[PDB]
Symmetry: C2
Subunit: 126 residues, 2 copies
C-alpha cells in the first residue's frame, strides 16, 4: 500500500475543522447581510432628504443655516457610504472563504472513504 498524504483520522479532523470555520463565517455573512440592509436604508432616506430641502417640516425658513444641514447630511451620507463599501467588500471576502471551504470538503470527503479502504486492507494483512 502506497499511502498518499496521511491517515483516516487526520482527515476526519480536517473536515471537523472546516465545518467549524463554515459555521462561524456563515454567521458573520448573515450578520453583515443584515447590517448592509440597515445602511442601504439609512443612505436611502438621507438621499431623499437632501432632495426634499434642495432648491429653497420641509419649509424653506432661514436659508443661512439650511446649508449647514447639507454639510451635515453630506457628512452623514458619505460616512455611511464609506461604511457600506467596507461591509460589501467584507461580505464577498466571506463568500470567497465559504466557497474555498466548500470545495475542500468536496475534495476531502471521497478521500475519506479512500483512506477508509486503505485502512480496511491493512486490516486483512495482519
Amino acid at each position: 500500500e502506497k499511502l498518499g498524504d496521511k491517515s483516516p483520522e487526520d482527515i476526519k479532523k480536517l473536515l471537523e475543522e472546516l465545518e467549524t470555520k463554515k459555521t462561524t463565517i456563515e454567521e458573520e455573512r448573515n450578520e453583515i447581510t443584515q447590517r448592509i440592509g440597515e445602511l442601504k436604508n439609512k443612505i436611502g432616506d438621507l438621499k431623499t432628504a437632501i432632495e426634499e430641502l434642495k432648491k429653497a417640516c420641509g419649509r424653506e425658513l432661514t436659508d443661512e443655516h439650511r446649508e449647514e444641514l447639507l454639510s451635515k447630511y453630506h457628512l452623514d451620507l458619505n460616512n455611511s457610504k464609506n461604511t457600506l463599501a467596507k461591509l460589501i467588500d467584507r461580505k464577498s471576502e466571506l463568500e470567497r472563504e465559504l466557497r474555498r471551504i466548500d470545495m475542500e470538503i468536496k475534495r476531502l470527503t471521497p478521500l475519506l472513504t479512500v483512506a477508509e479502504q486503505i485502512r480496511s486492507i491493512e486490516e486483512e494483512l495482519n
Copy 2:
C-alpha cells in the same frame, strides 16, 4: 428485499434537494437584508417620534399631532412588515435544516444503493 430505490433514483433526489437549497438560501439572504432595512427604518421613526416630543423646533401644535399619527402609522406598518419577514426567515431556516438532514441521510444510502448494484454486477 433491496432498499426500495436505485442509485439513479437517489442521485436524482439529491439533485432536487440541492436545487431547493440554492433557491432558499438566496431568499433567506435577501430577507436578511430587507430585515435590516426595516430595522433601521423603525429605529429612525422611534428616534424621530421621541425627538419632537422633546430644525425640529416646536411650532404649530395642531398639525404636529397628526404628524405623530402619521409617524405611528408609518411605524406600525413597518413593524407589521418586519414581523412577517422575521417569521418567513425562520420558515426558510427550517426548510434548510430539513433539507440538510435528507442530504445527510441519503448520502450514505447512496454508496449503499450502488454497493448493492456492484454486487448484482457479479451475479450476471
